[PDB]
Every structure is written in structure tokens, then in C-alpha cells.
Write a protein that binds this ligand. Structure first.
Ligand code: O6E
Ligand code: O6E
Lengths: 542, 48, 477
């Protein structure tokens, strides 16, 4: 609960939120780059700040102005809190018919009230959720979604289209059949490739909903994000290949995304609506599950600046080792207000579940194939060692470079230096050996992601050619070296960090990963250790 | 092995840790099939 | 023309002009009429909005993606769920009455079908992907919960199209059908094709009198009711279900990807004791769940194949390493033996006269008899594998009995041999419990008597690779 990146990131999220609020209240501008650079990834924040930040994110009392919210008490159908625009929406206004402490069954029709009562007294699962009801005065058809909080029942009322109910049923059956066809097309795919799966999913999603842009974000181990697929609208600027820092999506927001699968924002420029509450209630309402919760000012400003006006984010969940893990998101962006009906969200959730299942497929199969390939390469290297001198393992192919994904390899055998690919010079590797034996003497290995942060005084003159170094202690005098270059070499996107724009996010990310290679995975270290054990035994036999 | 319904949870910060405390800690579990629930709830008798 | 179960209607019309060409015999009484006669317009039999929806469905290229249609009757106004398909002759519509006439509850049910499917699939994906029995048990539990039938089982079709119940959930008053096998002849190939096409088949009442479909006197041949969901079951299957005890059934289809074209891995069959009709949203929720079931089954199958390949490779490597040390006679003298490379009940090695058995193997006399028989017929070959010693050429198979039914031999030079044996397929089947499942069982046994499980391709290639290793090693010396 300390070494994990999420817990450290919580305090940074709280600090950035506090900085944003302070800049907003004092009539200033939220400087993205300076704020991100000033606060580090550590933790120097007391309990009160974290508690207040969590309460503000979860209990804010502000909903989007496209639907109304009413909370009641399960005991006697008594209103204990409501949104203002409800009086606008239900048509109650011209003895008060919407005053706190009233009966919520007197706001709708008799049949709607009976259906509400049947959906109210219930059990672990109820079969009327959402309900289709009609207001008492006008007759506006409303979709009512009910959920439970610690003090009562929260009802989100969203307006529906006034038409023949046959068309209402058709608008759901067609939207579900489109998702079924998309899933069926996903099934009949040549396995073994993830890129094709993502490129099919983006097109299916864009054909289903109909937004102006669809992208897939994948989260790495660092917990930052990368765009892996995109389906734009021709004249729009492409974003594929973009990398943005981890702080762009706070951990609490990631948790919320994992809780409610599909989250939709209709307009980023509309005025949020206040929610009036009771005097007896201790704390504000919990909008942690309401489908009307308004986004915080930071994300609204970001969306307004970058160009999107609407949004619809869905969660990609896989099984981690029971336990669920957020692999990434599939996000649709538009350029105007857009509010899709309710069945489309369920169809999108179905498609996302199928996508997650196939993703688990491909990940596990790829891991097994990697294990098989590593085993074959190790066996061939052992055969080469048996047939010739040890130096043979670096002379012909396959060589030690084929063991793990890297940019260079090196073998040091009794002063003899065998470099393959990009590698340091003779004196450079001599100084590397000196430092390694001076600092880490009693060890069987060392894996660092940056020779600068590790403590090597020669990393600066070493350059960007090599940044990560994995070492295997064959003996006290002979070592095995794997060298990897900096992350920015494979980072390529076709694109004064004051505003909050994707260009500024890319600049911040490139600042973050300066002089740092990709993470050393565990399987690579396992293969290195196996090779080290075999080589140690073979050389001890001699 | 019951279908149940989605139960929402809220993060709280207690004892120097981030724990996802649930909303309502909850008897009378379901003892009838979903078919019976459909045949009971979707009863259009009050329209006479 | 065919027959239909008496819980719906059947109307076939011309695509171009909505011109009736044939109707079911109960259509003129369930739609409230008495007009239908012969050759009338369907738009005149429904309301204006329903007619508009029907025309919109007709015009669209893919007649799917617009099913079902919630049309309304005109003479009575009761709702009618309608399903449409194409028969190359015209468009065929099947009308199943809806018992929720409320315009407010119908939309709630139409959305709750999706919600229930999503909840069930979310429950499905929580399990780890490392076994199939858990997946099947979870699926049958969820299907029983959603449908509320009296029994739910899963059938698995083997390499010879015979079936085996692998998972079951029942109301504990009846005999448990888990572990039973039936021959391939119990399911016609045409029925398997139909299950591959329409991945749902529901029979409401096996004793219900079928209704004849009236045709037209201007078209040749009988219209194809294959795609219809109202097709009456055959008399043989009705008799089978009546004898078994079940009266209603709902068979889904589990479809996986194979060598691309799909392959029918098996079914998921639900049985009741009385006529059960079930409402539409639950049916569609189960239909949506079956797709995720198929996806996860394909995942598990591919992962299991990869794991088996890895295990076989490791076993072969260990065997080769043990062979290289000292004499090649040490293969059988150590705990890792030949019986781990292949799923066999016995192994044997004939090397320079001396014979090394392991497990269930024949005696030396029968061994040299087998060697003589092999050298008689198959002398120039490199290997052989018979799932039954008898019926294949061995005259002495009668002496072996039901313990060495299956055999697989690999010659080393011309006189040293490696044998993998196998007993008959009746020592791993228990089923502790006139057409009836009792009759189908042990008739499957007479079908498969004196025969072992067929040797799979992976085992054959493993044996070939090992044999090549023996040839290389013995050529080295
Ligand atoms: C201000 C408090 C900080 C902040 C808050 C915040 N962000 C989100 C959600 C997202 N942030 C996204 C950021 C980017 N940046 C990109 O480079 C990019 C696309 C190329 C986007 C859109 C992002 C991907 C999301 C997820 C939703 C989406 O795709 O729009 C939220 C949650 C909002 C909600 O409840 O829906 C909050 C509160 N983000 C910052 O950048 C500030 C540091
Ligand atoms: C008579 C003509 C032959 C015949 C025809 C036939 N069978 C089916 C479908 C099924 N047959 C099943 C048989 C069994 N026997 C069992 O041991 C067992 C369960 C343990 C069952 C239910 C079987 C598994 C099916 C599919 C499921 C089902 O529909 O119940 C059909 C197709 C019927 C249709 O879909 O219209 C036909 C025509 N079966 C025989 O056994 C006779 C030799």
C-alpha cells in the first residue's frame, strides 16, 4: 500500500486539485506544465487534504443539466433532496407540489406510482430498473434509473423521445443487433494479433454510436496511457501514437470509470445544476453511482480547450491474478452536444465485455508463445556452447541478443570484449564494471531502468544511445550485458505549456521519460537468470 | 451463484490507507427464480 | 408444406408487392379475424404504424437486425411479436403472441433483456481461465436461474460425433444424467446443420397437435420452413421426449472457431416436465449469454492445446536426456517413463530379444506373436497405430481380451519396437443410473466394443519425433 504507483499518485492528484482550485479562485490561469513539474510523485500531504479531495470528487452536489435527480427515503416515499431543474422538467410550476418532505408518488401518474412502488420494495435484484414513467401534469415520457445510497433511493430521470412505443422498442432491438453483429465479426478473426483486434473494435464502435472520433487508450505499468487505435473524420487532426502522463487520469477517476461502465458527458459548456438537501443530513449526497454526475472543472476546461464538446467513455476490464484490472478505455469524442439513448449504452457495454474477453485471449496466448520461443532460444544457445568455445555464443546466430528484446549485447570473457549491436566502448565498459563491483558486490544481478538515477557517474557522457543495462554475474570477473536505448527513440507522433492541450500533454510526457528506457519485465529477468545458472554450471565444470 | 444487482462503493481514507468502503453493509436473500420475479412484477392487473 | 407448433402463426408474402402466397391454418383465428382467404394484402391486416414498420423491414437489405417487430393487430388490437426471414421464394413471418399488452412494461422488458444478459456475462467473466468444468457448471447454473426449467445439461460432441453429458443441474427428485454417453446416430447431421444455422430451438409441448401450413397452387415444391423458429419436431424425437419424461425443451448452440468456418462444439439443452413457454426477454438474454460462452470456450481450448504442447515437449526432452546417459535401456528403469508421453494404459519396449513391459501389457509369447504378425503384413512401413487390434488384421486379438484393445507400434530398425497399448472405452465410463437414454447407453458400448480411444494427431507427432530420436541415437553407435 506504499510502493504501488496508485497510492503515491493519490497525493499528487490531491495536490494538483488543490492547485487548480487555488488558481481558479484567485483569478489566475492553471499552468499545466509548471504545476506538473513542481509537484513530485512522492507524498507530503496530511490526512485532511486527501479526505477533502475525495469528498469533493465523490460528494459535490452538481449534476449535468440534461436530466433531473430526486432522492427519497425508503420508509415512506418522502423526498429528502432534489435538483432544481426538476421543477423545470416535471412541469410542476404554474400548495407547493415540489417541497421537501412531500410524497414522491404524487409527482407521476397513478400507474407510474404503482410501478415505482413495486420497484421500491424489492430484494437483491429487481426487474423494473429502469422504469418508463409519465409525469402527472404534462405527460413527458421519462426513463427513471433507481439506485441505492446509504440514506435512501436516488432516482435519475432522463427525458425520452415522444413517439409510438413500437419505435421505442425498435430503437433498442436494432441497437442490440448491431452490437451482436459486431461481436460475431470479432469472433471470426485470425488470432495472434492485438492490433487487428483494436482496429476492428474502433470501427465497430464508431459505426455503432456515430461520434466524430473514436480512440483506444492502453495503460502501461507506469500507469500512463497510449493511443493504440483511432478512427477520425478525415479533416480532424489525428492523435494515434500519442503518449500522455499518468496524472491526466486521476486514480479516483479510474476507480469511478471501473464502477459505472459507460460514462457520458453531453455538453462541456453547459451550466451545472445545484442539488438542494436537508438540514438533518450530516454530509452531502453521494453521487458516486448517479449517471448525471457533472465532471469537475478541470476536465470541462480540458475538453473545451482541446475541441470536444461531448464524450462517452467505456472501460476495458480484464482478469488479473477474482480480481479485475483496467487495461484501458475506448473513448468517443464529438464536436457538439450529443445525448444517445439508454439502450445504446447497454449495447456498448456488451461489446466492451466481448472485447475484454478477446483481449484476455490474446494476452495469455502471447505470453505462452513468448515462453516457448525463449525456451527454444536457450536450448539452441546451450547446443552452441556445447559444440564450440563459449565465445561461439556471440559469434554466429542465434546469439544472446535473441534472448530478450534489447538494442545491444556484450560478453566479457577474461578481458576479451564481444559487443553486438549498439554498446559502450572498451574503457566505458571497464568503468561500468568498476562501478558495478564497487557498489553492488554481493549480488547475482542488477536491472536498472536508467543509469543516471541508479548512481552511475558516467551516464551523462554515455548518451542516449544506451540508457538501461541488465547485468548477469557469470563469475567475479566475467559478466553478461544487455543494453537498451531511451524510450523517446520509438516515440513518434505527427504533432509555453500554459493551456491544457494534447500537445502540452505530449511535451510533459516527453519531459517525464527523459533519459529512461522501457521497463525490464519479469520474464526477461527469469530468462536471464536461467541462462546465468546454466552458464555458471558449465563454467564451474571446467 | 445469484444474479444480484450492481452495488456501488465509495473510497474513504482511514487508518492511513485508501479503503473502498461499501455503501450499505447487508437478510432475506432471493429464493425464487428470475422467471417467477418476471411473472410477479410484470403483472398488469391494476389496469383492470 | 410442413407443420408448426400451435403457439404461433405463419404467413409468407411476396417481397416486391407484399402479396400473400401461403398461410398457417390457425392464422385466421389467433389474429382475431372472424378476409385472409387466399391472396390478400398483409398491410390491411395490421394498424398503420405496424404496416409502416413492416414495409421498412421489407425494404432493408439485411432482413435481420430488425427482428423482432412489435406490430399490432387490427381487429382486436392485441400485440404480436413478429419475426421475419427470407426463403428465396418470399418473406416468411412468424407471429408469437405477446402477453404484456402494456406499452410501459414492454419497453422495460426490452431493456431488461439487455441488462440481464450483461449481468450474467459479467458473472461469467469473473472466473479464471484455467478449466472448462467450472465454466460449464457456471453456465448451467446461470441458465437454470434465468429460465427456471427442471433440468439443464451440456452435451459435448466427440471426434466421431457421439455425445457425452459433461455438466448438469437439476431439481433433486430425478435421476442425474451426468456422465452418460450416446451414439452419433441419435442426432442426425441435418439437425446439427440446423443448430449451426439457427442457434436456438424451443419446443413448447411434445404432445401438441401440429398445424398444417396451407400452400398456393402456383408454385412448385414445398416451401422451406428450415429457418422458421416454429417448425414442428419430428415424430421420432417427439416419441423420444415422451418416453424420457420431458415435455418441453430449449436447445441452444455452442459454436467455436475451427479449421475460418465455425464448428459445433456442443449444445446446452434445458428440459422441463410440463409445457413451458417462457417470455421473450429471458430467451434473448440466454441467446446473448451463449455468445460469451462460446468465446470463453474457444479461449480455454486454445490455451489447453498450448499447455499440452509444452508438457509433451518437456517430457520428450527429459526422456531424451535420460536416454543419452549410459545405456538406452534406462528409459523404463526410472520413474519418468514412456507412459507419460502419451495417455496410455501400458507401454512396452522390445530391444535385442529382452522385453521390457510397463503397466497393462501382454506377455512375451503374445509379444513375439504380434511381432511376427507385423513383419508379415507391414514390413516396409515406419509405424502403425490401430485403435482396435481386431478388425485391423491381428488374428490373435481374441486372446488379449478387453485390456489391449488399442495399440500403436513404432519400429526402430526392423526388430526393436516400441509399443503403446490401450484398454477398451468402458473402464472410464460409469453412468451410475423402446427409445430411452438407458437404451442409447450400452448401445453406444456395443457400438464401441473392443475398441480404444483413437490416437490424436499430437500424440502421433510426439511418437514420430521420439522415434526419429531413437533412429538418430542408434545410428550414432
Ligand atoms: C484536473 C483536475 C486534472 C484532470 C482531471 C480529470 N481528468 C479526467 C479524465 C480524463 N483525462 C483525460 C485526458 C486527456 N489528455 C489527453 O491527452 C487526451 C486525449 C488524447 C485526453 C482526453 C482522459 C483521457 C480522460 C478520460 C475521459 C476522456 O477520454 O475524456 C477526469 C474524469 C472526468 C469524468 O468524470 O468523466 C478528471 C476529473 N485531468 C487533467 O489533465 C488535469 C491535470
Ligand atoms: C429418430 C428419427 C432418431 C432421432 C432423431 C432426432 N433426434 C434429434 C435431436 C436430439 N436427439 C437427442 C437424443 C437424446 N438421447 C439422449 O441420450 C439424450 C440426452 C441425454 C437426448 C436428448 C438429442 C441430444 C437431441 C438434441 C436435443 C433435443 O432436441 O432434445 C432430432 C432433431 C429434433 C428437432 O430439433 O426438431 C431428430 C430428428 N434421434 C434418435 O435417437 C433416433 C435414432
Amino acid at each position: 500500500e506504499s510502493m504501488s504507483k496508485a497510492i503515491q499518485q493519490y497525493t499528487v492528484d490531491a495536490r494538483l486539485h488543490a492547485v487548480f482550485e487555488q488558481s481558479g479562485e484567485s483569478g489566475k490561469s492553471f499552468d499545466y506544465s509548471q504545476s506538473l513539474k513542481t509537484t513530485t510523485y512522492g507524498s507530503s500531504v496530511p490526512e485532511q487534504q486527501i479526505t477533502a479531495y475525495l469528498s469533493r470528487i465523490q460528494r459535490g452536489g452538481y449534476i449535468q443539466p440534461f436530466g433531473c435527480m430526486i432522492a427519497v427515503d425508503e420508509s415512506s416515499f418522502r423526498i429528502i433532496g432534489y435538483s432544481e431543474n426538476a421543477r423545470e422538467m416535471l412541469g410542476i410550476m404554474p400548495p407547493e407540489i415540489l417541497a421537501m418532505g412531500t410524497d414522491v408518488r404524487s409527482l407521476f401518474t397513478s400507474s407510474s406510482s404503482i410501478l415505482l412502488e413495486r420497484a421500491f420494495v424489492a430484494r437483491e435484484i429487481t426487474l423494473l430498473n429502469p422504469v418508463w414513467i409519465h409525469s402527472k401534469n404534462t405527460g413527458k415520457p421519462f426513463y427513471a434509473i433507481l439506485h441505492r445510497i446509504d440514506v435512501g433511493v436516488v432516482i435519475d430521470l432522463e427525458p425520452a423521445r415522444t413517439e409510438d412505443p413500437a419505435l421505442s422498442i425498435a430503437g433498442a432491438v436494432q441497437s442490440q443487433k448491431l452490437a451482436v453483429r459486431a461481436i460475431s465479426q470479432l469472433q471470426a478473426l485470425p488470432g495472434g494479433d492485438i492490433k487487428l483486434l483494436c482496429d476492428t473494435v474502433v470501427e465497430s464502435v464508431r459505426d455503432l454510436t456515430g461520434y466524430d472520433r473514436v480512440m483506444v487508450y492502453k495503460f502501461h505499468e507506469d500507469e500512463h496511457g497510449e493511443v493504440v487505435a483511432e478512427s477520425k473524420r478525415d479533416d480532424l487532426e489525428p492523435y494515434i501514437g500519442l503518449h500522455y502522463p499518468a496524472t491526466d487520469i486521476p486514480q479516483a477517476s479510474r476507480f469511478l470509470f471501473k464502477q459505472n461502465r459507460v460514462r457520458m458527458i453531453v455538453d462541456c459548456n453547459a451550466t451545472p445544476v445545484l442539488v438542494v438537501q436537508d438540514d438533518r443530513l450530516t454530509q452531502s449526497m453521494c453521487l458516486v453511482g448517479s449517471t448525471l454526475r457533472a465532471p469537475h472543472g478541470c476536465h470541462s476546461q480540458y475538453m473545451a480547450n482541446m475541441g470536444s464538446i461531448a464524450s462517452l467513455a467505456m472501460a476495458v476490464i480484464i482478469n488479473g491474478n477474482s480480481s479485475m484490472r483496467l487495461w484501458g478505455l475506448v473513448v468517443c469524442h464529438h464536436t457538439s452536444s450529443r445525448c444517445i439513448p439508454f439502450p445504446l449504452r447497454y449495447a456498448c457495454e456488451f461489446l466492451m465485455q466481448a472485447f475484454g474477453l478477446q483481449l484476455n485471449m490474446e494476452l495469455q496466448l502471447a505470453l505462452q508463445m513468448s515462453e516457448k520461443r525463449v525456451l527454444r532460444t536457450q536450448t539452441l544457445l546451450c547446443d552452441m556452447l556445447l559444440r564450440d568455445s563459449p565465445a561461439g555464443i556471440v559469434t554466429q546466430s542465434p546469439s544472446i541478443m535473441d534472448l530478450v528484446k534489447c538494442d545491444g549485447a556484450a560478453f566479457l570473457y577474461h578481458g576479451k570484449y564481444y559487443p553486438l549491436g549498439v554498446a559502450p566502448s572498451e574503457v566505458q565498459i571497464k568503468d561500468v564494471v568498476e562501478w558495478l563491483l564497487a557498489n553492488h558486490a554481493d549480488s547475482t544481478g542488477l536491472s536498472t531502468d536508467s543509469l543516471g538515477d541508479a548512481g552511475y557517474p558516467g551516464a551523462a557522457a554515455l548518451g542516449d544511445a544506451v540508457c538501461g543495462m541488465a547485468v548477469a554475474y557469470i563469475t567475479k570477473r566475467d559478466f553478461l550485458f544487455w543494453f537498451r536505448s531511451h524510450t523517446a527513440k520509438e516515440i513518434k507522433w505527427g504533432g509555453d505549456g500554459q493551456r491544457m492541450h494534447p500537445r502540452s500533454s505530449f511535451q510533459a510526457f516527453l519531459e517525464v521519460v527523459k533519459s529512461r528506457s522501457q521497463p525490464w519485465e519479469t520474464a526477461e529477468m527469469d530468462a536471464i537468470h536461467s541462462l546465468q545458472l546454466i552458464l555458471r554450471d558449465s563454467f564451474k565444470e571446467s | 451463484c445469484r444474479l444480484s444487482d450492481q452495488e456501488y462503493m465509495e473510497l474513504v481514507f482511514e487508518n492511513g490507507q485508501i479503503l473502498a468502503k461499501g455503501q450499505r453493509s447487508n437478510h432475506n436473500q432471493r429464493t425464487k427464480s428470475i422467471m417467477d420475479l418476471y411473472e410477479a412484477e410484470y403483472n398488469e392487473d391494476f389496469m383492470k
